[PDB]
Amino acid sequence: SKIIFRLLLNVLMSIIAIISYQWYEQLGIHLTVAPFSLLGIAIAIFLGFRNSASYSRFVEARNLWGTVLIAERTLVRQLRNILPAEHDAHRRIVSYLVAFSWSLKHQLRKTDPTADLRRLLPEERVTEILASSMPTNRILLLAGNEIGQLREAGKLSDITYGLMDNKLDELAHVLGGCERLATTPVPFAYTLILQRTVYLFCTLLPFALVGDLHYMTPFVSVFISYTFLSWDSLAEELEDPFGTAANDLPLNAMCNTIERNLLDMTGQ
Amino acid sequence: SKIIFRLLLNVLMSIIAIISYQWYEQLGIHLTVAPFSLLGIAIAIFLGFRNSASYSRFVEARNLWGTVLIAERTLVRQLRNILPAEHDAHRRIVSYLVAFSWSLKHQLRKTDPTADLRRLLPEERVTEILASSMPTNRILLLAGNEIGQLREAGKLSDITYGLMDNKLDELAHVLGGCERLATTPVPFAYTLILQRTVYLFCTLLPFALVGDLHYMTPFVSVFISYTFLSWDSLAEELEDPFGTAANDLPLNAMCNTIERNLLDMTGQHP
Amino acid sequence: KIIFRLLLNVLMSIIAIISYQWYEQLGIHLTVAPFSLLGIAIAIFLGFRNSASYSRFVEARNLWGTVLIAERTLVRQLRNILPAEHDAHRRIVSYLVAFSWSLKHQLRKTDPTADLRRLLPEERVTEILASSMPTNRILLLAGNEIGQLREAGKLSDITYGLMDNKLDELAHVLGGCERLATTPVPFAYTLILQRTVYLFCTLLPFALVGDLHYMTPFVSVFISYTFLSWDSLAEELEDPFGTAANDLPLNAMCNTIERNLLDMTGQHP
Amino acid sequence: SKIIFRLLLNVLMSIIAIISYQWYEQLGIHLTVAPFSLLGIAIAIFLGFRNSASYSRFVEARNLWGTVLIAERTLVRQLRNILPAEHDAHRRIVSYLVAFSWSLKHQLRKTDPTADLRRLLPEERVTEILASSMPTNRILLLAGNEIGQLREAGKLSDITYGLMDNKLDELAHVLGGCERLATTPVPFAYTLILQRTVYLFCTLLPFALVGDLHYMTPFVSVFISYTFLSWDSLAEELEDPFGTAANDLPLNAMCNTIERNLLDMTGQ
Amino acid sequence: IIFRLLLNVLMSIIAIISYQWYEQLGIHLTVAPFSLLGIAIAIFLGFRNSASYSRFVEARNLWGTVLIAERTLVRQLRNILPAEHDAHRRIVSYLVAFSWSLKHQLRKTDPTADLRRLLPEERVTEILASSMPTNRILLLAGNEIGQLREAGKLSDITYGLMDNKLDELAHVLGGCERLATTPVPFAYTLILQRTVYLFCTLLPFALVGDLHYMTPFVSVFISYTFLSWDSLAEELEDPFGTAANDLPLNAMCNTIERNLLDMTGQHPLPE
Ligand SMILES: [Cl-]
Ligand SMILES: [Cl-]
Ligand SMILES: [Cl-]
Ligand SMILES: [Cl-]
Ligand SMILES: [Cl-]
Ligand SMILES: [Cl-]
Ligand SMILES: [Cl-]
Ligand SMILES: [Cl-]
Ligand SMILES: [Cl-]
Ligand SMILES: [Cl-]
Ligand SMILES: [Cl-]
Ligand SMILES: [Zn+2]
Ligand SMILES: [Zn+2]
Ligand SMILES: [Zn+2]
Ligand SMILES: [Zn+2]
Ligand SMILES: [Zn+2]
Ligand SMILES: [Zn+2]
Ligand SMILES: [Zn+2]
Ligand SMILES: [Zn+2]
Ligand SMILES: [Zn+2]
Ligand SMILES: [Zn+2]
Ligand SMILES: [Zn+2]
Ligand SMILES: [Zn+2]
Ligand SMILES: [Zn+2]
Ligand SMILES: [Zn+2]
Ligand SMILES: [Zn+2]
């Protein structure tokens, strides 16, 4: 995306570097390569470790979404295996489950869940849900009432209620996990420290290479900038896993997979 | 080897650098190693981390398949332990669990499961399964009906129902975990340019190496190219552990083992 | 701060420039290759060290996230299981809110008396303040609420246990934070590092000056910034319960917790 | 100490380079160290990550056996605390649990468990175990039958029956884990590639240092080589956790510790 | 470690005065080779100290679980059997006994005084008879729970809730046992420790060509960095070693004891 602008600036920096090499020692400035080896290696080590942290936050995101599909699938399986006649509670619980997924998606994307929710629930409760500052948690509490009701109506025992309650728990952990990843980012000092350092390193590098490489510094220094810049750029494509880029999590696709999955297990 | 063809190319590029080395002065070419020491160390550091990430995908994928064997082994044990006489149920349930494994392998290899399914289940069921968006998930839900039936029949209590129920949860987690590794590759950005910049570094390397090595240049360049290139491609191999490469997982062996286990001696037990 | 030692590195480099006149006069040589070696080694160690510091930070944030999850689902279980017992709802929630603030005060080594008094009867405040661990005692109090529900027959051993597990989870959160605070790594991790990172940074100009001459301070400031930036960010991340910049907004996280629990039990602050 | 061969071949590889030295430049061949630092470092990085995998695998094998001891300790405890009257059942379950460990060791070493089985169990049960294609697994089935019938005899509720069933689940995870470790080495491509490069690098190296070290080539090129080889040999020393070499897991001693523990807990 | 630092300044002054005679013979020490060697040792020290750190972290987690399990077990006892203070005090004894006994076991020191202060000498003899005393303390703790269950004061459900806490301690015992027996590397740590030791002493000879009278200064700055990093992995590799820091294990056995007496109103002193 935005890297091409910074490598062409690096080509001109090299042109500026060759056209300026004659005036060099007259001013009194000597740039060997060896301290830039030190610096560049150092920057690579820190870039490597940072990029590690970023990949890990991306996979934790993806795991958290995998749990939603896992936990919702087995909740519905448990409903059918334990209460195979009660298709009325099936449809209601399933719609709260599908609501929860879509609501979680919209919450992380900071978008509006009204249509998805009205598509799935009566305005009777859709207003109760959006009346809360924590709508997705409220959907869980409502799904909780459903199994709670089947327990008090004697159709669930304490045991079988507990078996399903634990899947609510699993969805609660997904909710908190997602919220935690969304609010708490990879500390901003990483991008600030490394974006400066990397950008300044690629810019100062030609003036250090020209002593030894002469007319060829434009090439090998755009090379070195390319790998540093794109390694660094891939960290930022991974640190916001809930964003919209094609390189991010296809959250719409996953919510669709979830809905068709639960609607499949219900015969719809 | 995708490496054997490139390795030779690097030999030629190495030949070109030595024949046309003293001519550097005419065209205006100086080329030190130190900029390529730096560049190459950075690429090693990044190769190392990427390879680390791919092995993690390998071991998780191995692990997830490990749990199928475990969870199925113990669900059959619980049936033999709690309903020792219910052999028609034992037989029915084992067939679904063996279907689960083969079905999952096919799902992850994008191959057809119909042959394996019919080998193991009634054809009415082979069509209920093949009809679904997710057949592995349906095989699970049918396995859960069998123990759900024994529970309506009073043969299982809620407690012992839950004990067997938890093993089906365990398999749902394998299914989900396997889809996550399938459905999401690692970002192709990683693959898109990390493999080109390794090649690029590899071919240019002799052009900066000759001045110090002279004749010894084709050897040392191909050595360096070997290590960097085998590392990069091994990483891309283990990234797709449900693939069919030589270092991917033996999914077919593993389903065989699962099958042989659950049908150990006609499915007969003490 | 960090900007002070950056400045002194600019000083140390002009000291190098002026006393370069006298280098082999006094009998002095300083190539850069040895400092490249030392420099890279320190980079590697800073790389690993820093990675462990981030891991502690993520764990602390994760632990606090579990407070919210567990407390949410405890209130959820109370409402689904005992929809009528609103006094218990109110008392448990006031304990679970007391737990969060008391944990914040614990981790910050501050007095929890104000927040406790806001939230609970003074006879309980005194009980909680007497304990070598107020958060532990608050969990026990919460545990008596559901336990008394259980003696009265309103909870079964099963549904009592479902809720007990949540208190178990908070216990684990308590120990996890206790363990992250009560365990600074042996001071070797920092006086190997921030001593050597400091020392390396200010000797680097003397070694850089033969190659670079008047340029010394610029590269020397760049290398020193890079190393110092990395090394200081490590020190912030490893005390995540402190008051520094990159440290958990524990008061915000508590307010979110209280508001969530007030939300689920129909109350408006 | 399979390693002292290549250290000494290195010493003579440096002497060959000492004598062949000035035949170089009209032969024309030159070797500086700079490109070998590049390679040497790149290999050190790859050696580091590989040894890392090799170490995690040894730790997992040690963990797995560790929890055999944990889960059988606590399963025997539960039997004491819940059925203190029933020392006959105590002694049967303990022999199955001791048998499981021995059988799991034999399995992993591919040795005959028959003598150990016949020392712990009635020959009727030995016959059933050895008839299975998965003897260790079939030992768990038999142990589960013990507690299974204590359940049908009403001496265990479903609750306490389930408390002990979970310990058999834990042993099931040990068995599968060990089988998995046993058949899933660190991929061969790893150690295959490193050995070709680490070995080739260690012999070519003195050729590239005599130009700089002259007469001291051996003492420095051997010291560099001991370092890569001993680091790469640590991987070999950690590759078969279940074998019988000195650096492998003392599985016999662990199996004796397990038996000793379970007999301390039942007064034998 | 400081002794090996001052052997390095010696080796440096040797390398200065003897640099004269060196190449009358023809012995060269450049710096590029020792740079390649030192970076590789730095890299391996990086991964080694990573492994060591993880062993140290797992050790602190296991001990943390002791405090967690023992707190929640005693909380469970109070919330579920509020009246049974005699049982409260017996079980708290075993839990506290278990902590000190685990610590003594790990540091191979004598548990007898801690045991004789916490439990009756009939149970001290029983515990001290076993070859696995910490396990025997868990088994004893189990009997207390089991008797409450046979007396019908615990249901199988609520008996089971407390049983899980004992498993948690069982897991801690085994984990700690495994982290003790081990070094997982079978004494290679001695090979790679003296590899740092030798590199640090040949280093001033490789540096004197470039640095002359300055080499003792740059050579030991480097050596301090490498030796401190090594000795630190040595400290973390062995979190129960017979020359470790006992402050936190003692601190933890004291915290849990104090917590438990607090939780059972044996603190504070009555009015
Ligand atoms: Cl689940
Ligand atoms: Cl299992
Ligand atoms: Cl929860
Ligand atoms: Cl256990
Ligand atoms: Cl007995
Ligand atoms: Cl399990
Ligand atoms: Cl071996
Ligand atoms: Cl006994
Ligand atoms: Cl606990
Ligand atoms: Cl008491
Ligand atoms: Cl009390
Ligand atoms: Zn689950
Ligand atoms: Zn239905
Ligand atoms: Zn209806
Ligand atoms: Zn709107
Ligand atoms: Zn399992
Ligand atoms: Zn059968
Ligand atoms: Zn030539
Ligand atoms: Zn939870
Ligand atoms: Zn209420
Ligand atoms: Zn366990
Ligand atoms: Zn007995
Ligand atoms: Zn072996
Ligand atoms: Zn716990
Ligand atoms: Zn009491
Ligand atoms: Zn006290």
PDB file of N, CA and C in Angstrom, chain E residues 195-221:
ATOM      1  N   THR E 195      32.460 -23.120  27.521  1.00  0.00           N
ATOM      2  CA  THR E 195      32.688 -22.551  26.192  1.00  0.00           C
ATOM      3  C   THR E 195      32.657 -21.023  26.239  1.00  0.00           C
ATOM      4  N   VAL E 196      31.756 -20.450  27.037  1.00  0.00           N
ATOM      5  CA  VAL E 196      31.794 -19.014  27.295  1.00  0.00           C
ATOM      6  C   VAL E 196      33.065 -18.652  28.051  1.00  0.00           C
ATOM      7  N   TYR E 197      33.452 -19.496  29.011  1.00  0.00           N
ATOM      8  CA  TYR E 197      34.623 -19.220  29.839  1.00  0.00           C
ATOM      9  C   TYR E 197      35.888 -19.109  28.989  1.00  0.00           C
ATOM     10  N   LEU E 198      36.035 -19.991  27.996  1.00  0.00           N
ATOM     11  CA  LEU E 198      37.233 -20.000  27.163  1.00  0.00           C
ATOM     12  C   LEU E 198      37.229 -18.862  26.149  1.00  0.00           C
ATOM     13  N   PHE E 199      36.087 -18.608  25.502  1.00  0.00           N
ATOM     14  CA  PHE E 199      35.961 -17.475  24.585  1.00  0.00           C
ATOM     15  C   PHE E 199      36.318 -16.162  25.269  1.00  0.00           C
ATOM     16  N   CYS E 200      35.909 -15.993  26.524  1.00  0.00           N
ATOM     17  CA  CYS E 200      36.182 -14.741  27.216  1.00  0.00           C
ATOM     18  C   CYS E 200      37.661 -14.531  27.515  1.00  0.00           C
ATOM     19  N   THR E 201      38.460 -15.591  27.519  1.00  0.00           N
ATOM     20  CA  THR E 201      39.865 -15.456  27.867  1.00  0.00           C
ATOM     21  C   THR E 201      40.783 -15.408  26.645  1.00  0.00           C
ATOM     22  N   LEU E 202      40.437 -16.090  25.548  1.00  0.00           N
ATOM     23  CA  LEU E 202      41.125 -15.872  24.278  1.00  0.00           C
ATOM     24  C   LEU E 202      40.769 -14.538  23.633  1.00  0.00           C
ATOM     25  N   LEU E 203      39.741 -13.850  24.132  1.00  0.00           N
ATOM     26  CA  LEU E 203      39.283 -12.630  23.466  1.00  0.00           C
ATOM     27  C   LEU E 203      40.315 -11.507  23.499  1.00  0.00           C
ATOM     28  N   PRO E 204      40.966 -11.185  24.624  1.00  0.00           N
ATOM     29  CA  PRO E 204      41.909 -10.057  24.600  1.00  0.00           C
ATOM     30  C   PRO E 204      43.061 -10.271  23.640  1.00  0.00           C
ATOM     31  N   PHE E 205      43.437 -11.527  23.389  1.00  0.00           N
ATOM     32  CA  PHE E 205      44.464 -11.816  22.392  1.00  0.00           C
ATOM     33  C   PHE E 205      43.978 -11.464  20.987  1.00  0.00           C
ATOM     34  N   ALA E 206      42.688 -11.666  20.717  1.00  0.00           N
ATOM     35  CA  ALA E 206      42.136 -11.297  19.421  1.00  0.00           C
ATOM     36  C   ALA E 206      41.929  -9.794  19.298  1.00  0.00           C
ATOM     37  N   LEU E 207      41.848  -9.084  20.416  1.00  0.00           N
ATOM     38  CA  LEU E 207      41.527  -7.669  20.365  1.00  0.00           C
ATOM     39  C   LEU E 207      42.761  -6.778  20.356  1.00  0.00           C
ATOM     40  N   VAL E 208      43.881  -7.259  20.913  1.00  0.00           N
ATOM     41  CA  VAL E 208      45.051  -6.412  21.148  1.00  0.00           C
ATOM     42  C   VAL E 208      45.629  -5.869  19.847  1.00  0.00           C
ATOM     43  N   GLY E 209      45.438  -6.588  18.737  1.00  0.00           N
ATOM     44  CA  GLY E 209      45.870  -6.066  17.452  1.00  0.00           C
ATOM     45  C   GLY E 209      45.199  -4.753  17.097  1.00  0.00           C
ATOM     46  N   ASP E 210      43.942  -4.583  17.500  1.00  0.00           N
ATOM     47  CA  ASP E 210      43.193  -3.384  17.161  1.00  0.00           C
ATOM     48  C   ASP E 210      43.171  -2.347  18.277  1.00  0.00           C
ATOM     49  N   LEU E 211      43.451  -2.740  19.517  1.00  0.00           N
ATOM     50  CA  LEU E 211      43.147  -1.899  20.672  1.00  0.00           C
ATOM     51  C   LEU E 211      44.333  -1.626  21.582  1.00  0.00           C
ATOM     52  N   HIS E 212      45.399  -2.421  21.515  1.00  0.00           N
ATOM     53  CA  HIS E 212      46.633  -2.176  22.256  1.00  0.00           C
ATOM     54  C   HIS E 212      46.360  -1.960  23.745  1.00  0.00           C
ATOM     55  N   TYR E 213      46.702  -0.792  24.281  1.00  0.00           N
ATOM     56  CA  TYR E 213      46.595  -0.642  25.728  1.00  0.00           C
ATOM     57  C   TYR E 213      45.150  -0.566  26.212  1.00  0.00           C
ATOM     58  N   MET E 214      44.174  -0.407  25.317  1.00  0.00           N
ATOM     59  CA  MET E 214      42.785  -0.338  25.751  1.00  0.00           C
ATOM     60  C   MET E 214      42.136  -1.704  25.931  1.00  0.00           C
ATOM     61  N   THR E 215      42.788  -2.793  25.506  1.00  0.00           N
ATOM     62  CA  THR E 215      42.099  -4.082  25.472  1.00  0.00           C
ATOM     63  C   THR E 215      41.588  -4.558  26.826  1.00  0.00           C
ATOM     64  N   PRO E 216      42.295  -4.406  27.952  1.00  0.00           N
ATOM     65  CA  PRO E 216      41.695  -4.865  29.216  1.00  0.00           C
ATOM     66  C   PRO E 216      40.359  -4.209  29.526  1.00  0.00           C
ATOM     67  N   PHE E 217      40.104  -3.013  29.005  1.00  0.00           N
ATOM     68  CA  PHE E 217      38.844  -2.346  29.299  1.00  0.00           C
ATOM     69  C   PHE E 217      37.711  -2.895  28.436  1.00  0.00           C
ATOM     70  N   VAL E 218      37.912  -2.951  27.118  1.00  0.00           N
ATOM     71  CA  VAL E 218      36.864  -3.453  26.236  1.00  0.00           C
ATOM     72  C   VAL E 218      36.683  -4.961  26.404  1.00  0.00           C
ATOM     73  N   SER E 219      37.752  -5.677  26.760  1.00  0.00           N
ATOM     74  CA  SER E 219      37.678  -7.134  26.843  1.00  0.00           C
ATOM     75  C   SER E 219      36.820  -7.604  28.019  1.00  0.00           C
ATOM     76  N   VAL E 220      36.853  -6.897  29.147  1.00  0.00           N
ATOM     77  CA  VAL E 220      36.060  -7.335  30.290  1.00  0.00           C
ATOM     78  C   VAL E 220      34.658  -6.726  30.295  1.00  0.00           C
ATOM     79  N   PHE E 221      34.466  -5.548  29.688  1.00  0.00           N
ATOM     80  CA  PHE E 221      33.105  -5.091  29.442  1.00  0.00           C
ATOM     81  C   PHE E 221      32.347  -6.164  28.682  1.00  0.00           C
TER      82      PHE E 221
END
